[PDB]
Each structure stands twice: as structure tokens, then as C-alpha cells.
Amino acid sequence: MAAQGEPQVQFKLVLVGDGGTGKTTFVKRHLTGEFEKKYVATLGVEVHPLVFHTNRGPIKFNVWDTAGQEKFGGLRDGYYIQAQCAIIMFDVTSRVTYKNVPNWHRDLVRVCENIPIVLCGNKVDIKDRKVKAKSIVFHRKKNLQYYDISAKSNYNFEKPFLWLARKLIGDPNLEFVAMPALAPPEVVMDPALAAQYEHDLEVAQTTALPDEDDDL
């Protein structure tokens, strides 16, 4: 339980989509609150623990952020084996990215068949949207949930996780609870603690607030 990171429950979530969609940025936002401006490719898979507090208690989503560079196939089976839910990400400003969604939601279903999957249309903040919400019909055919999200502006940032939690747990009434604040560590040390801090600081310094089309 503890090894898994499941307070009570742990859910294996596979995050897939084309390169440059914002999968990594989405995960980073949830973990730290920072907005990653720099696009650095994810190689293979990066496993990131994310905990949310709900009405029924804390739940952990072990997010498997996968590489969008990799070709669809049997090579990628390990990532999807025993997945409980998935998020397929596309960029609303890229038609090509949207076109590849059926390929992602084919490779995925080959391994896990029917499991809750949410399609997220990233970068909705940008004014010149190419893939209109009205146009998207893929979700209807495949019985997937669709959410307009913006990593940059945090628009509907928590919705995919919440929806997935509701279906997996089985309570349609599940709601996010703030979570009692736990006192921060004093921080004396230096061995395990050092070096890692610099990485976060750099991300923060580089990041300027994303005013794309916030005004509109």
C-alpha cells in the first residue's frame, strides 16, 4: 500500500498523446503549480505520483507520462498493461495532433479495452483555435469524456482527474476537498535534499505568467 503510494487507493493512469501537446506541462502544473515554458522531450516514460483529496479520502494517481515520439505498437504495451484509466491529449491549435487521437485510442484499447478515458483539448487559451469543440465527435463514437483544458491558464485543470475518480470509485457525487495543511519540513540536511532544489528554481525563474489570450 505504502510502497504503491495508495493512502487507500492507487490508480494507474496512462497519459498519452502527440509530442508538444502539453502532457508534461499538465503533470508539472499538478505537481508543483509551475508552468513549464520550455519544451523538453520526455524519453520513454516518466512516472509521477499525484494525490488528490476527495469526499471519500485521499487517492493517488500514478501518472505514467509517455513519450509522443514513439510509434504506435506492441513496443508500448508495458506502459498500458494494467492501466485503470487514461488521458489522451491533443493540441487544439494543431489539426495533425487531433488526427492522431484515433491512433492513440486504438493502441490503448487493444491492451485495456473498456476503461475510462478522457480526451483533453489543450491550449484552449489561444485565440486561433483550429479544432473547434463543436467539431469534435470522436468522443461520442468512442464513449469518451471531452474536456477543454489549458495548462497555461488552469482552465478546467482538475476536471479530467475528478471525472476519472468518479467513474473509478463509482460515486457520481465525488468532490475535491482542499486537504488539511501539513506543516512544512524545517530543512537542515544537505545530502538527499541538495541539487534537486536548483531544478525547481530554474523552472520558476524562466516562467513568466502565460497571458496568451486571457484578455479575450
Annotation-wise, does 124 bind a ligand?
Answer: yes
Annotation-wise, does 200 bind a ligand?
Answer: no
Per-domain residue ranges for the chain? 1-216
Is domain 1-216 in CATH 3.40.50.300, yes or no?
yes
Concatenating the DSSP letter of every residue in 36-74 gives: --S-----SEEEEEEEEEETTEEEEEEEEEEPSSSPSSG
State the angle between helix axes of 196-206 and 23-32 in degrees (0 to 180), rounded to the nearest 10.
Answer: 110
Beta bridge partners of 119: 88, 146
Cell numbers linked to 47: 512516472
How far is residue 175's CA from residue 54's CA, in Å, rounded to a whole number?
6
Beta bridge partners of 148: 121
Annotation-wise, does 74 bind a ligand?
Answer: no
What 3-state DSSP class applies to 155?
A: strand
Which method, experimentally, gave rise to this model? NMR
* Contact between residue 25 and residue 68 where contact means Cβ atoms under 8 Å apart: no
Beta bridge partners of 16: 88
Long-range contacts of 195-202 (CB under 8 A, 24+ apart): 200/32, 200/34
Annotation-wise, does 159 bind a ligand?
Answer: no
* Contact between residue 58 and residue 43 where contact means Cβ atoms under 8 Å apart: no
Cell numbers linked to 62: 500514478
How far is residue 25's CA from residue 39's CA, in Å, rounded to a whole number?
8
Annotation-wise, does 155 bind a ligand?
Answer: no
Burial classification of residue 92, based on how many CB atoms lie within 10 Å of its CB (0-12 exposed, 13-18 middle, 19 or more buried): buried
Annotation-wise, does 57 bind a ligand?
Answer: no
Listed residue (26, 208, 193) closest to 121, CA to CA: 26
Annotation-wise, does 20 bind a ligand?
Answer: yes
Annotation-wise, does 38 bind a ligand?
Answer: yes
How far is residue 186's CA from residue 166's CA, in Å, rounded to a whole number?
36
Annotation-wise, does 36 bind a ligand?
Answer: yes
Q: How far is CA 199 from CA 37, 116, 169, 206, in A?
A: 14, 34, 35, 11
Strand pairing report for 117-122 and 85-91:
parallel
Annotation-wise, does 33 bind a ligand?
Answer: no
Q: How far is CA 114 from CA 12, 14, 84, 121, 192, in A?
A: 14, 14, 9, 21, 41
Annotation-wise, does 66 bind a ligand?
Answer: no
